[PDB]
Ligand SMILES: O=c1cc(CO)occ1O
């Protein structure tokens with residue numbers, strides 16, 4: 001219970017500089033690519049085969065999978081600079097702004113801004129603009145540059161709201177069968193964003209656009225980790241709120257979705273990451 | 284140095300009936316799929332991006348990657364039945380037969396035979412015939428059944444020979460820059476099969492045909508593990524023959540291909556698996 005993950009808006013001008021700095025090093029070393037690849041692989045790993053569920057999304061493992069993912073990422077950051085932890089982007093507050101694209105998270109010294117229309121939506125500002133940050137496509141081949149198109153889609157013109165988060169925290173079940181996109185009264189499916197989709201998690205992805213808008217390339221954008229840090233935080237909150245509800249399914253769910261099954265591409269299980277405090281961090 | 288890995292031809296009927304039994308259980312539990320997925324993911328993970336190299340092939344990590352792969356596979360088998368270890372298919376010997384398709388490895392009680400032309404070359408005999416063993420395509424979706432077409436291609440009508448193996452063992456360097464398909468005088472590139480390709484390792488894949496003939500689906504066929512057990516054995520032999528030769532490169536090679544880099548999709552390094560015997564097994 002020592003690493004503290006902070007709200008992006010609470011970070012020092014130097015804490016942000018170091019976070020960005022460390023992400024570039026991870027990228028330069030070739031470590032960052034392993035994360036893009038891991039997420040892409042998991043997204044194509046259906047549980048079971050032919051199904052709509054995959055190791056990292058559209059099922060119960062969605063939350064514990066990304067928590068493990070973030071922990072790994074944070075440990076690598078820690079290996080470069082032990083002062084650096086994973087911050088979270090509290091999008092539900094940014095949603096209140098007149099124009100969310102003006103949030104400090106998109107400043108040139110931190111994530112950079114929206115995509116450039118005259119450039120096809122090719123982020124040209126910030127530390128990860130094309131020319132300073134390589135991207136890979138779904139095939140694993142270089143792609144030419146990060147793209148973003150804030151709220152351009154008709155389905156997700158706006159970021160999720162505080163109300164949306166609060167209502168989700170009200171659900172009593174972690175998840176419910178058939179443990180997939182159609183699950184009802186499921187905190188997991190709700191937070192993920194499938195109830196009246198796209199909502200919450202899925203909605204942020206859709207709102208950002210660019211690589212963030214699709215599963216196979218999403219992690220190409222560093223904000224992916226800031227997004228999922230908030231999703232993880234929301235889950236940690238839900239866990240304290242319903243301290244007597246536990247992960248589901250415990251058994252008889254698809255292999256890879258049960259409480260003690262390994263989560264492809266790793267051997268770690270949901271049980272292994274149920275208590276974030278045990279993982280060494282708090283929000 | 285305790286688990287003993289045997290020549291398929293030295294296995295009793297019971298040892299074979301047990302190996303097959305255990306592979307089916309692994310399959311039924313959903314573990315077997317994790318291996319298909321791991322190999323497919325590694326094959327699409329280029330080091331570096333845009334390059335021709337991958338995490339499991341066409342570069343220095345080819346040998347230590349598959350050794351780790353088999354070790355993990357063997358441990359899972361061991362978890363099901365502690366008396367079952369990974370056998371090896373000594374194709375060099377089978378190459379001497381008038382008709383290699385008559386080798387006991389393809390018996391109906393073990394790997395099953397060649398594909399059925401009428402069926403489009405679907406394997407209809409043995410424990411893994413279509414109907415008894417599911418497969419998946421490159422996309423992770425069910426594919427309908429294992430296929431094999433022994434020596435059907437013009438490039439690999441025959442299995443590699445003893446001479447081919449012996450000549451490879453004479454190579455003095457583990458590998459040589461640029462640590463890829465074009466490497467010359469390298470044991471790794473030679474054994475892999477790129478010198479006057481397709482030879483040795485690549486040749487067996489090509490000879491078997493079906494899913495075994497292509498990178499993204501090759502593990503779908505259980506013989507994949509018997510093949511790679513022999514390739515691993517050949518490397519173990521090379522290691523004793525050149526007691527004073529070590530893995531290459533140790534540094535300044537592409538991330539993931541260096542002596543102490545993690546090998547996607549895992550964190551294990553070539554150093555971690557250099558001594559097979561410290562892994563708990565011998566041939
Ligand atoms: O719920 C949804 C989420 C997303 C985001 O990728 O896209 C479409 C949806 O319907």
Ligand SMILES: O=c1cc(CO)occ1O
Pocket residue numbers: 476477479480481482485486488489496498
């Ligand atoms: O050298 C080769 C190796 C392989 C194996 O996949 O296929 C074709 C080749 O020419």
Ligand SMILES: [Cu+2]
Pocket residue numbers: 039056057215218
């Ligand atoms: Cu995702």
Ligand SMILES: [Cu+2]
Pocket residue numbers: 201205228
């Ligand atoms: Cu996501």
Ligand SMILES: [Cu+2]
Pocket residue numbers: 484488511
């Ligand atoms: Cu192979």
Ligand SMILES: [Cu+2]
Pocket residue numbers: 322340498501
């Ligand atoms: Cu292969």
Ligand SMILES: [Zn+2]
Pocket residue numbers: 006007010
């Ligand atoms: Zn704070």
Ligand SMILES: [Zn+2]
Pocket residue numbers: 043044422423
């Ligand atoms: Zn898919």
Ligand SMILES: [Zn+2]
Pocket residue numbers: 092162165
């Ligand atoms: Zn909130």
Ligand SMILES: [Zn+2]
Pocket residue numbers: 171172241242245
């Ligand atoms: Zn409750």
Ligand SMILES: [Zn+2]
Pocket residue numbers: 236237240276277282283
């Ligand atoms: Zn907490």
Ligand SMILES: [Zn+2]
Pocket residue numbers: 289290293
């Ligand atoms: Zn023997």
Ligand SMILES: [Zn+2]
Pocket residue numbers: 296
């Ligand atoms: Zn017999």
Ligand SMILES: [Zn+2]
Pocket residue numbers: 296299390392393
């Ligand atoms: Zn037999």
Ligand SMILES: [Zn+2]
Pocket residue numbers: 375445448
């Ligand atoms: Zn031999």
Ligand SMILES: [Zn+2]
Pocket residue numbers: 446
């Ligand atoms: Zn000869």
Ligand SMILES: [Zn+2]
Pocket residue numbers: 519520523559560565566
């Ligand atoms: Zn040995």
